[PDB]
From a paper:
One of the most important groups among [name]-dependent enzymes are transaminases (TAs). These enzymes catalyze the transfer of an amino group from an amino donor to an amino acceptor. In short, the reaction starts with a holo-enzyme complex where [name] is initially bound to the enzyme through an imine bond with the ε-NH2 of the catalytic lysine (internal aldimine). In the present study, we intend to better understand the molecular interactions that govern [name] binding in three industrially relevant ωTAs, namely from Halomonas elongata (HeTA), Chromobacterium violaceum (CvTA) and [name] (PfTA).
In order to compare the three enzymes at the molecular level we crystallized PfTA in the presence of the cofactor, [name]. Data from crystals grown in a condition with PEG6000 as the precipitant diffracted to 2.2 Å resolution and the structure was solved by molecular replacement. The crystal structure showed a tetrameric arrangement of PfTA with the cofactor positioned at the interface of two subunits and [name] linked to K293. V129 is well-defined and in proximity to D264, which is within hydrogen bonding distance to H159 and the pyridinium nitrogen. The X-ray structure of PfTA herein solved, shows that the 4 [name] binding sites are near to the oligomerization interface, which may link the stability of the [name]-enzyme complex to the quaternary structure. A similar structural rearrangement has been observed for the TA from Vibrio fluvialis and from Pseudomonas sp. Interestingly, in PfTA, an additional Trp residue (W174) seems to further stabilize the Y159 of the [name]-ring motif into establishing π-π stacking interactions with the cofactor pyridine ring. In this case, the binding loop is also constrained by the interaction with another subunit of the tetrameric structure. Both factors (the quaternary structure that provides a more rigid environment typical of tetrameric TAs, and the presence of the non-conserved tryptophan in close vicinity to the tyrosine) might contribute into explaining the high [name] binding affinity. In both cases, the corresponding Val residues (V129 in PfTA and V119 in PsTA) are part of an alpha helix located near to the oligomerization interface; between two monomers and near to the dimer-dimer interaction. Therefore, the replacement of that Val by an Asn may disrupt some crucial hydrophobic interactions required for the assembly of the quaternary structure needed for the enzyme stability, but also for the enzyme activity under [name] saturation conditions.
Author numbering:
A (entry chain B): 10 to 459
B (entry chain A): 7 to 459
C (entry chain C): 13 to 459
D (entry chain D): 11 to 459
The structure:
């Protein structure tokens, strides 16, 4: 019951991303239930969930379609592997559905996992094996971007573009390099986004040339950087990435764990930039968070390498016990059907557009707002101590937490990443939900002048 | 489409990268599409029924069709499908499961749980915890990991780097620096001795000497399975793990017990390490922790480890690890129900007893059939190792036909047993009975009779 | 047994063995002043200065006699536990004297630039372990940097030519944009280029987390990278950055050390005091192999900590402090100081660069001319508007080089760049001779 | 002379030492050498059992080498082997080395300046070789416990003792060290033939575990020097050659000490009847008169570069002073001395005599746990108790007491922890042996244990 849960909250847990010392006195809310876009804690406090779980409950809470798919599959066959000798029906169905839905990008095969970190890990392993199959085993290095976030296994962590995720676990993998990215609001080059895109592309090219292209396997990048603070690159940037990868003969890995299946207002973030990656990483929203599932998709160029007469090198020696878990796959199938039938990519585009417009008005109103960024239903409000210098609030400062808490205490679940308020609701959000959130945020800023 | 047999058959493997396999092989040799499971049996799309000696993949420990787990899952999914343990929030099944796991592993001294989704995550988490632990304790040079020949620790770059068989490693090199593997006490294939106690002591001394060579001040942890699973069901001598604990105490490195297979009963004790009377510093759990019904893993730590975060160490004491689906309320609901099943039906004891019986019956098979070079087991993990000649122990290769013939003769007579190279692997649900044992042994015997060597 | 065995039993440095079957190198037999003579009596002005190293010229009785006298007295004894030797002690004091402006108080000896760099890298790592920050293990360096050939130095190089055949190299070595005005994607303003490259360096350090970074290593003027002189503001910014992020500044002075760039040290030429300095090549005028890695008081004092085994310096080669090498270096350093060759390099190099700019005006193939003191390069391009370089396979640069060699001037190429690094005793008359021959080479090979 | 004493250690980073120790315990300033004797600045004369540092193999004051050096420096002090040029002493020395190492199949030399350079060169050569042969995954190096392979990052990563490694971590990925057949200290057996076979099988299984397709080479010393003069069983190195052949990895012989005679054969590998793929030489190659190293390769390795492989066939290695004409002139004179005076045979005979005398000493004094030697490479290992083989630690006084008694009675012998190391010039005589043995005997008598 409630008292037991409150007593035991955090005591036997290593909570992600937190210092356990802070949790002795500052206990997290015990979220008890969800319906639609709202969540309710054990004490009955109700919120609009602007976190959307954690960028993943894209279809909303309480979807009977997914619950029923999960129950029926688990009643019939709770588990069987895709390891030598067997497969299962939901995994087959989901594999075909994914090659269908990502046909535009040229995806022809799926490798399943359980979350975004393993989707990324799978992608990195695939790239290395691909080049060994292609008779270029020196191609082993990975390039990624400043502010990129690619998950927490040693591979993805080595590919991350912020040291916060890396420093305590060093030394990380050799051969991982990060380069300047087109973050307009904080860059040393220019206030022109097209010039910024081009200078960042050329920096990337010159680092690749420095490494020797014959030693580089792939570039990995998010179409829109999520955990790095919702950084939307200039539209010319990703086409340049595709050109650079073609030029130096390295793979383009699109980390679509957040942008996959609609959030940024296109069915894929790459598609939103009109770019076809070689490899795509999907997780989070692909199952609406109801059951863990990830998928790494590859194109024919990549897949055909395993059709070489290469002996043991053509054995795909990867894949997790729960790869293709039939309950995961059932959930993912129902969620993708919802995404398509209700055109949540378009709803994200429109409601996200409206949301972004209202935030821009809010920015003019409240001096602590240094920057507002968004595409579809991924948005961030960046708070600064001084607009002229763009000096950020530190993790230690109180103001971001004050704004967050004023929202939370008035029924709007918005949390921070350092100095940035992050907005990533379910893709079923309405303009009315937007107006509610904007009203509460406005009141929060009014009550906390800067 | 998930109910359309001819569709399933025509799209089987076409759009998928199957684990551990050459896609060239799958155009003509199509895997069985398993459609349903009940108890210890599974049924394919064509209605063929099998005793599932794979136990899914060492993980359906409670059996198929368990209403307890199904209902727990449904009810939790109706209430709250998901919410994170990230700054600001938690959920009730995650709190409950964290407390349950520390209770069940009280004997080993486990006080905190870090959740993930599968064994590879559990291992990666253990490795990250060890490195951060030693930075917290003011010894940041302690970064190296030692593991064992034939060890399997999953497939992310960390775990893969810790594996003791190159099959999982070579296509993805170069792997992580600072991972070293040493001689392990594999009685059937070792260059030292036919005496198991002498083998344990020599392997212990070899380990010590490699640690000393690395300099202990650069080594963070030893990782090892209480009984090696994918390496081919290799049961160490009883003295080995107590020596491992002693070696770790002597050199001041952490002992990580990879219990992804042995955790929660399969080897005939609730934990493999407990089976050896050893308390690890960190325990990796997955697979059977949820009976395979929903992906879940847990990495447990003792007080010694957890308290390193209880210091003013600035940003070094922020645990910057944890997966989006860490603590998934549905996964945790499933794991709570499976653990209640394991405890209430004493599946650790059933694994112990029925496994002892299974191993005895396997020795009869070894007596009759020349190709069986070795039979191994503890609790309900067993292997039958096939060799071309017993005097030399020359193994069948992955390319050879005999192991596969024995397997197919079983599958075609209602017994799902597959191979890892030259070894037939047996890891059924822990609810297996002695009568199930005899059914499988009769089928296996007939397979060997039909395939003389 | 010389022309018949030339290259036959040899793995020649920096070369494709396929090329050596087709055309064999000149067997150089003798040297005098700034001239060299081959086995057939062909005489050349040596614009290579051996290999950036015969800084005092050939045939210096001062150095030859120092060497003979020492080898007659004591050919060798080590600096290992229990022993030392006199020339090593003397050279130690001389180096701390000469580099007093930079704050250098200790030297670790070696045999060449690669070991000097390896020594600096090991010192930096051990320093941070002594200072209680063992996570500080990564190294940052510059595009076009050249830091020798052992695995550390090779890892630190900023050109892939030295790297790709030996991969995978050391983890934790990162290279960043450097201010090469002639070829950069940012600006043609050198002050703006210096500042943008400094900010790029800062942001890469921050990306790595400064607590994982040990040191920056850089050449005051980049040599093998093609004689790239940075803007004057750049190195003060490097010192500022290293102070801000608490990483060591390693100055690779293997070429610029002891006068070639027109200051006794390149870092001095920029008014910057490094934490660690690498010296080789010209330190002994190439007469006997010798290198020295110097450290300041900040670095040295870390070993005075009660740190147990961490404070044992487990580095140093058999021939560290070789008495003959040290005697040769003492004589060469005396010559550098006695004849003020740093000032001569400054003045005659200024003159050389002026003459080269006139040549640039005259001949379309010269895209850029660069120099500081007596390190100069003429960079040849297929079209100046695009700066398209000649490739290693192209004939024109080798044609110019061969016309010089066939007219008594030893100038070789680094790809599309003619490199000039003569002895520091070079005169304006030597300059005019070389310039006339170069001019006729261009006239005879019109572009 | 007074200035030498005042500035001793003051401006210097002394190898292998804590600088705090050097403020008060100053090293002896060695001033001159003749024959096998050295003299310090105070006129104290010593028999140099260090042979400089395993390197003054022809003795001190050799007119042949001094004159070769002087005349060469008089003619041409330096010119490079870099694109466009070469020099005569370099050509001559390459041919001489290919002739002297003909038995081993050595056909090409890449020159350097010291043993660390020779090892680094071997490692780079191996990696580039396998890339040329179309197997670029072959990058890992296996070496032996107690192996010493110099101090650059590659060689340091290959070392088999952590003392050289821990202060500079993290070292290179892909370097692995295995059990070696050190009879005196091993967990397996007191039978050397059995020890050789078990260590060979441990090496095989580690290679197999790594996957042979990822391993470039094994590097090992025919007799381990800095690790404490560890002589392997005679069967071991033939097994090493068999293993390298079986798994298709290169065998690198680190002959920096054993090269050119010290162990009683012209090469240690020859002493074991084994032909390596790559050989590392330094130290004695020039009798220590001028810094020089050479890395030799056989036809198997060399032919890889004769391929149309584009840039991969460019040897982008070689130091400024590779093939330094003065160094090469010195080495040619030193090799001439080694051959004409058959110093390999003298090392064999006088070393066997030396080892016999040391065994008598072991019978005499309980502090001696073990005596080891081949040719003029010998060690006396001191232990606090023979039954347990408990060593003296670096902190203990007894080994230093024995060493100081020898030094104070005219015999220059130093320690590596608990081991007295003996490596005199290869011109050592039986008379010299008896001189040293008398002094050592009295040192032990004066310091009973
Ligand atoms: C862009 C991106 N990459 C990788 C990951 C890793 O996913 P997970 O947190 O499920 O391991 C996430 C989340 C993500 O948003
Ligand atoms: C011992 C062991 N460790 C780790 C793993 C990795 O688990 P998963 O296959 O769920 O990634 C497995 C399987 C295993 O048996
Ligand atoms: C800056 C620098 N460092 C190091 C070296 C290494 O010199 P060497 O080739 O003599 O080892 C050189 C040449 C150099 O120019
Ligand atoms: C002494 C030694 C080295 C070190 O060589 P340096 O000349 O000191 O660089 C390397 N390898 C072996 C086998 C040695 O004996």
């Amino acid at each position: 019951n409630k008292a037991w849960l409150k007593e035991h909250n955090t005591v036997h847990m290593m909570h992600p991303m937190q210092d356990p010392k802070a949790l002795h006195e500052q206990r997290p809310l015990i979220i008890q239930s969800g319906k639609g876009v709202h969540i309710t804690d054990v004490d009955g406090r109700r919120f609009i969930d602007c976190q959307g779980g954690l960028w993943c409950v894209n279809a909303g809470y309480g979807r009977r379609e997914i619950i029923d798919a999960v129950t029926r599959q688990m009643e019939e066959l709770a588990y069987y592997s895709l390891f030598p000798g067997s497969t299962n029906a939901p995994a087959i169905a989901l594999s075909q559905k994914l090659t269908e839905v990502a046909a535009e990008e040229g995806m022809v095969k799926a490798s399943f996992g359980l979350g975004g970190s393993d989707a990324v890990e799978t992608a990195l392993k695939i790239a290395r094996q691909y080049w060994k199959l292609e008779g270029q085993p020196d191609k082993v290095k990975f390039v990624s971007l400043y502010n990129g976030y690619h998950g927490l296994n040693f591979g993805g962590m080595s590919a991350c573009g912020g040291n916060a995720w890396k420093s305590s676990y060093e030394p990380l993998m050799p051969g991982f390099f990060q380069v300047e990215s087109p973050h307009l609001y904080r860059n040393p080059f220019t206030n022109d986004p097209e010039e910024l895109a081009e200078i960042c592309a050329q920096i990337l090219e010159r680092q690749i040339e420095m490494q020797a292209p014959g030693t580089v396997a792939a570039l990995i990048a998010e179409p829109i950087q999520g955990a790095g603070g919702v950084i939307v690159p200039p539209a010319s940037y990703w086409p340049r990435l595709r050109q650079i990868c073609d030029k130096y003969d390295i793979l383009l890995i699109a980390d679509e764990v957040i942008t996959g299946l609609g959030r940024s207002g296109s069915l894929f973030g790459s598609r939103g930039w009109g770019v076809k990656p070689d490899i795509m990483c999907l997780a989070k929203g692909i199952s609406s968070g109801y059951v863990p599932l990830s998928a790494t998709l590859v194109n024919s160029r990549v897949a055909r390498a395993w059709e070489r007469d290469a002996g043991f090198t053509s054995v795909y020696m990867h894949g997790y016990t729960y790869s293709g878990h039939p309950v995961s796959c059932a959930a993912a199938l129902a969620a993708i059907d919802i995404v398509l039938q209700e055109n949540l990519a378009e709803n994200a585009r429109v409601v996200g557009d409206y949301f972004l417009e209202k935030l821009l008005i809010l920015k003019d109103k409240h001096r602590a707002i240094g920057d507002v960024r968004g595409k579809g239903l991924m948005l961030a409000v960046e708070l600064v101590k001084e607009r002229a210098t763009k000096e950020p609030f530190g993790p230690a400062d109180a103001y971001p937490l004050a704004i967050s808490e004023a929202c939370v205490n008035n029924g709007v679940m918005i949390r921070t990443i350092v100095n940035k308020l992050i907005i990533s609701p379910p893709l079923t959000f309405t303009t009315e939900h937007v107006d509610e959130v904007i009203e509460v945020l406005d009141r929060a800023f009014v009550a906390n002048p800067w």
